[PDB]
């Protein structure tokens, strides 16, 4: 009764990073076959936790978070790694005892006319709490004049588009991301897959 990792990684549509998706994984044997899951991921790094057959351990819950951002900003998804995405589009805890994986998606998410499905939360009042999310889509009345729910002069919308085009280089090519949070509460661990 293995965990549904195939649903997470090989999903057709990934989420915009601002409304980053989260798939709970519980009550299943999480046998990690990333060494031969038939996909040469750009890179991989387990923060705090280790990938060296640590499957033996039993975790309470595993929250798998998914989204797409630009290669340039692939690093932003790390503990202490401040930036747009970190500060406005999902963030990890400094004590992140979890793995993170991501890869090039230019041949999955780059669209001829530009890809505008993926949106990055540009601005926000405060930095996001770890694993917090915001889907706020309200105009900000920066101006001393109102916005009347429209965007314009000193009246701004809180989102923007990555406009992915294959012509673009590695830096601005779409890169999908999957995160592995390992929860251990008082509830009996539901996932080991030793």
């Amino acid at each position: 009764n293995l965990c549904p990792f195939d649903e997470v990684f090989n999903a057709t549509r990934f989420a915009s990073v601002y409304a980053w998706n989260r798939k709970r994984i519980s009550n299943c044997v999480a046998d990690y076959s990333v060494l031969y899951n038939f996909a040469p991921f750009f890179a991989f790094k387990c923060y705090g936790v280790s990938p060296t057959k640590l499957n033996d351990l039993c975790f309470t819950n595993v929250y798998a978070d998914s989204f797409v951002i630009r290669g340039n900003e692939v690093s932003q998804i790390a503990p202490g790694q401040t930036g747009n995405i970190a500060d406005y589009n999902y963030k990890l805890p400094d004590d992140f005892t979890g793995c993170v994986i991501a890869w090039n998606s230019n041949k999955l998410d780059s669209k001829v006319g530009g890809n505008y499905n993926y949106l990055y939360r540009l601005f926000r009042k405060s930095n996001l709490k770890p694993f917090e999310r915001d889907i706020s889509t309200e105009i900000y009345q920066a101006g001393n004049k109102p916005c009347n729910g429209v965007a314009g002069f000193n009246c701004y919308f809180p989102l923007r588009s990555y406009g992915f085009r294959p012509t673009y280089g590695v830096g601005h090519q779409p890169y999908r991301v999957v995160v592995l949070s390992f929860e251990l509460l008082h509830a009996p661990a539901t996932v080991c897959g030793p």
Partner: antibody
Amino acid sequence: EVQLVESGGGLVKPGGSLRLSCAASGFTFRDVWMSWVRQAPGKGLEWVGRIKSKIDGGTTDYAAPVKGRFTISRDDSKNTLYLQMNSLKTEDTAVYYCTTAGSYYYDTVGPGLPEGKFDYWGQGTLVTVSS
Amino acid sequence: DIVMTQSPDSLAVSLGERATINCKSSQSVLYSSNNKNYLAWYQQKPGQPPKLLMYWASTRESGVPDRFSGSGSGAEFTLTISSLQAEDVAIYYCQQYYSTLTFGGGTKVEIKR
């Protein structure tokens, strides 16, 4: 190449029922938001309906005049689109195109376009609703 | 839905002259979330299917000449052909995709000779 071949148009009695069928080939069919667009003689294009990719839900939308008289279907294993037409009227006499129009702006398909484009239309069969 | 409108209905200019079409929407097709117009232009020669010219209101389809060029934003778009060629004769439709699909009234383009 890619091709969209509509079949099953003709004469049908007023109030009668007719099944249109669009056989698609060349592109990743199941990922595209397929639509029917009709055209009466001399009159302009009019969107009929849309089926989204089954991974994107498979929601159907219909226009105001055909609202709840038509029923869109899909078969991704056979790469074929259907339009079920019921309680037909003399207003409905028109040539019906199946198309990938309105898809690429929302759909999940990437840059590997078959012939370097995405918007494709069929020749479209003529539905005459006369007694 | 959105009432796509076109003007004029008929049009006729000499070879190599300025051919000018317009579009009016009952709503705005400018989506704030990406700042893109969800509008297209379609060329249809009699007896044939429509061919896509323009999408995102500006972007040309592979192989369409620079002759064609769509502009505008929001609810008052326009497609102008710099110099009208013989084959350019056709009816053109401004279809927005912002809300499902709704096509314009139509603008017939003809050559003076």
